[PDB]
Design an enzyme around this catalytic site. Structure first.
Site, PDB file in Angstrom:
ATOM      1  N   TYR A  39       0.828  -1.202   0.000  1.00 49.81           N
ATOM      2  CA  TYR A  39       0.000   0.000   0.000  1.00 49.81           C
ATOM      3  C   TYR A  39       0.871   1.265   0.000  1.00 49.81           C
ATOM      4  O   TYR A  39       1.646   1.487   0.924  1.00 49.81           O
ATOM      5  CB  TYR A  39      -0.908  -0.052   1.236  1.00 49.81           C
ATOM      6  CG  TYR A  39      -1.601   1.243   1.586  1.00 49.81           C
ATOM      7  CD1 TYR A  39      -2.319   1.956   0.630  1.00 49.81           C
ATOM      8  CD2 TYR A  39      -1.567   1.735   2.893  1.00 49.81           C
ATOM      9  CE1 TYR A  39      -2.992   3.132   0.965  1.00 49.81           C
ATOM     10  CE2 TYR A  39      -2.234   2.901   3.240  1.00 49.81           C
ATOM     11  CZ  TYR A  39      -2.945   3.595   2.273  1.00 49.81           C
ATOM     12  OH  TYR A  39      -3.618   4.741   2.624  1.00 49.81           O
ATOM     13  N   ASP A  48      -1.856  -6.187   8.983  1.00 48.44           N
ATOM     14  CA  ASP A  48      -2.900  -5.218   8.673  1.00 48.44           C
ATOM     15  C   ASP A  48      -3.963  -6.037   7.948  1.00 48.44           C
ATOM     16  O   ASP A  48      -3.797  -6.393   6.780  1.00 48.44           O
ATOM     17  CB  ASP A  48      -2.350  -4.122   7.757  1.00 48.44           C
ATOM     18  CG  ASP A  48      -3.383  -3.064   7.419  1.00 48.44           C
ATOM     19  OD1 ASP A  48      -4.593  -3.383   7.406  1.00 48.44           O
ATOM     20  OD2 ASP A  48      -2.983  -1.914   7.145  1.00 48.44           O
ATOM     21  N   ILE A 101      -7.162  -5.107   7.350  1.00 44.15           N
ATOM     22  CA  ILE A 101      -8.275  -4.218   7.029  1.00 44.15           C
ATOM     23  C   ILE A 101      -9.173  -4.811   5.933  1.00 44.15           C
ATOM     24  O   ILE A 101     -10.347  -4.466   5.839  1.00 44.15           O
ATOM     25  CB  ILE A 101      -7.747  -2.824   6.589  1.00 44.15           C
ATOM     26  CG1 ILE A 101      -8.906  -1.833   6.449  1.00 44.15           C
ATOM     27  CG2 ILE A 101      -6.977  -2.947   5.288  1.00 44.15           C
ATOM     28  CD1 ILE A 101      -8.452  -0.400   6.165  1.00 44.15           C
ATOM     29  N   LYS A 112     -12.953  -0.304   4.746  1.00 44.99           N
ATOM     30  CA  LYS A 112     -13.106  -1.072   3.519  1.00 44.99           C
ATOM     31  C   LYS A 112     -14.233  -2.084   3.422  1.00 44.99           C
ATOM     32  O   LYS A 112     -14.853  -2.198   2.366  1.00 44.99           O
ATOM     33  CB  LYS A 112     -11.765  -1.730   3.190  1.00 44.99           C
ATOM     34  CG  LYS A 112     -10.599  -0.749   3.286  1.00 44.99           C
ATOM     35  CD  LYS A 112     -10.821   0.495   2.413  1.00 44.99           C
ATOM     36  CE  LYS A 112      -9.753   1.561   2.675  1.00 44.99           C
ATOM     37  NZ  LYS A 112     -10.010   2.834   1.928  1.00 44.99           N
TER      38      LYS A 112
END
Ligand code: PPG
Ligand code: PPG
Lengths: 424, 424
Positions: free
Chosen positions: A136, A221, A223, A264
């Site tokens: 990211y 992470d 998410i 998200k």
């Protein structure tokens, strides 16, 4: 003397969109946004819930007004009811294969805040964290800007589907040495942004073995955990820790952490709901005190505590989100195939990792940027070039499919086919 | 190797309250909370407004649902309508004597986040900022913990009502030298926490002259700006910059900044609405990017944009807040007088700076702590000892008067008089 901290295609293409955004009525020839990972597929489900349960948003509880109580609620441990709803939701996303202690969950203003806080807690300025590439683009700011921490890449290649390998891990650890940096941990994204793939059990065991040997931390992470819409199955780093004689044995379990957010899956990035989860009491305590700089609005905590406490809603939402996500991803894959463009076989996320190597003038990042610019100005489409994600292989692009109407996606696919059929 | 950052009566007394909190029905003998600066005096005014204007909280605008739009709003420039409502409210608080450009306002998760961000933007690790004592205990964490910045005190004494003087400024600047620290600016609180006094025009000109000579910044935390309930008049640092041939002249105007929040005047600390205001384009840009780690919930931004856009509400709220604050402060002053205890003549804030020097065993901070503990365990009242605020003079205490019912305040005053009439 102004300070230092006060003094990239991913952000570039984004700005270019702002200058001339697409509109199916006013600017039908404008740039179509496919470069930002957002989810606009299921708002009707949330809007429906709000219409049927108006009390939470009205600052009402059991028919009683609690506006004053919420207005005054600023405890950095978070709203009890919300913390409980969150750990329950995190368990559900994981098929209840793992449970989370709300006292070990720390709320933060989005995962952006959560990741930075984790770095502040585990690394000192001048030290480093290892991160699998591609990753990211936001991490280059989130993990390093105010922390003084450096990022050392763990290079992944298409040869094996961009999976993490033992060789890549040691090469990264060794590069950290060449750079005179002390490694404090590894931060991975599972499911992966931008790959759109769920981490394999193999990779997870490899990572755990690695951080165990090196005596460092592993931050996952997750998410995108609720966006796994196709096989293989998503496996949380916390599940692998379950049965492996590490529940109360070994010490690596104390160095495995998770980052989450409602941006998200539920599509609520504007509400800034992020979370840190750690088995280490000291990390939780430190992160809790640090959350003071980015607490979640109590108004929002209350609303979502009510929303996420509704088991019928969470169950139906995850199911429908998976359904709609899968359908949309298939449409992008199908649309790209008609232009002779393939994607890395993915099963999660809000984007596809697209293979456009055969459309490059040459196997160079310079050629990648040329193609990217052509797609932006000639095709009027904003997608992200692999180099923005630090991919070592030129030619890959991240294309987001859930942040626009299906019809606009089809239009984008039509304009792309005309492009390829024109030059190649 | 755990990191460094991950590894005080103000916080102590607070915890002691948690262990045995007061309750006019269940625990009428418990500790009464008078150590936290919060405002519970005007919630009825806000509750009334919400009852008459239910749309904002319902995610409705002009009868249209905008839940999806707000859910997706995460722009770090903030919600346009809210920024405008905020600058208008800031102007109103200042009698419209000064105007603020919304493009120069940056929203943050509370002033806690705003102050830390300002430090990150203006000072590097190892440098320092000067702060008049006594000051808000929270600054010891907010300004130094993750920033690596040090605080050098500008000592103020009761001899002149704890006002800033030229001698105190140079002595602070000189101590910074003795500590081998580079000073980057001065951060003041106007109105003052814990003094409960508004900064004088004299002090403001002195500060401006000082930062001009030293070539440093001046940050004014004006979170209590809307709580000035008695003469003299509150004077924002931005007003003094108006007429002084510095509007477009000189360069000091570029180094004067303001921090604000809705936590204290409107009593909305749980919503985390803070703000940074700067005339320097570069500071605004840097702070904007930094706000990514602590953005304000869009749900909250929308609600308050509607609330603060109502000019009838803001006008009546400020007026009534001033009225109720003045009445409550007078009750505390009157109650303390009956015990032979005087306060520094204040006119703002949510607390009084109380003089209990005559109740000390001796003129030492050791004696101050003895008295403090006695008031906590024997009187069952939580107030803050001056040393927690870094006051150089033993014997002063901060007593908060707006975070409890009037009757509970009277009870506290009764229990205090029994205490003084028992030992002294
Ligand atoms: C792996 C990962 N972690 C953390 C975050 C931050 O999310 P937060 O919880 O703070 O809202 C993102 C957002 N990813 C993107 C951010 C987009 O924001 C730009 C505006 N749409 C993206 O396009 O990949 C992400 O992809
Ligand atoms: C001068 C000053 N600046 C900033 C802040 C932080 O406010 P924010 O906008 O982040 O909410 C405070 C809060 N002051 C106190 C904080 C109390 O919090 C503890 C719980 N009540 C206090 O007791 O003096 C303050 O007094």
């Amino acid at each position: 003397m102004l300070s230092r901290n006060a003094t990239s295609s991913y952000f570039l293409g984004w700005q270019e969109y702002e200058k001339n955004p697409y509109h199916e009525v006013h600017n039908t020839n404008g740039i179509i946004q496919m470069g930002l990972a957002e989810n606009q597929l299921c708002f009707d489900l949330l809007e429906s819930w709000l219409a049927k349960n108006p009390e939470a948003a009205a600052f009402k509880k059991n028919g009683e007004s609690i506006f004053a109580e919420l207005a005054l609620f600023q405890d950095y441990h978070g709203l009890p009811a919300f913390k409980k709803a969150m750990v329950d939701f995190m368990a559900e996303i994981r098929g209840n294969k793992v449970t989370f202690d709300p006292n070990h969950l720390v709320l933060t203003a989005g995962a952006t805040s959560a990741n930075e806080t984790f770095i502040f807690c585990l690394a000192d300025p001048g030290e480093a964290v290892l991160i699998p590439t591609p990753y990211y683009p936001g991490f280059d700011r989130d993990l390093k800007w105010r922390t003084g921490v450096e990022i050392v890449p763990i290079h992944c290649t298409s040869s094996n589907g961009f999976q993490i390998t033992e060789t890549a891990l040691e090469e990264a650890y060794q590069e950290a040495e060449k750079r005179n940096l002390r490694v404090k941990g590894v931060l991975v994204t599972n499911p992966s942004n931008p790959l759109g793939t769920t981490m394999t059990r193999n990779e997870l065991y490899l990572l755990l073995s690695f951080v165990e040997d090196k005596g460092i931390h592993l931050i996952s992470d997750e998410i995108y955990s609720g966006t796994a819409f196709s096989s293989p199955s998503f496996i949380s780093v916390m599940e692998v820790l379950k049965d492996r004689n590490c529940d109360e044995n070994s010490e690596v379990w104390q160095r495995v952490h998770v980052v989450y957010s409602l941006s998200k899956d539920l599509g609520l990035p504007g509400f800034r709901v992020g979370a840190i989860y750690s088995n280490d009491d000291m990390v939780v305590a430190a992160a809790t005190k640090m959350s003071s700089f980015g607490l979640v609005s109590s108004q929002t905590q209350h609303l979502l505590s009510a929303m996420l406490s509704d088991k019928k809603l969470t169950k139906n939402y995850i199911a429908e989100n998976h359904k709609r996500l899968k359908q949309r991803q298939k449409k992008l894959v199908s649309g790209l195939q008609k232009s002779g463009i393939s994607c890395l076989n993915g099963n999660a996320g809000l984007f596809c990792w697209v293979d456009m190597r055969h459309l490059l003038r040459s196997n160079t990042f310079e050629a990648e940027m040329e193609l990217w610019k052509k797609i932006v100005y000639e095709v009027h489409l904003n997608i992200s070039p692999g180099s923005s994600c630090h991919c070592t292989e030129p030619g890959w692009f991240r294309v987001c499919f859930a942040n626009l109407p299906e019809r606009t996606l089809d239009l984008a696919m039509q304009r792309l086919k005309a492009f390829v059929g024109e030059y190649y």
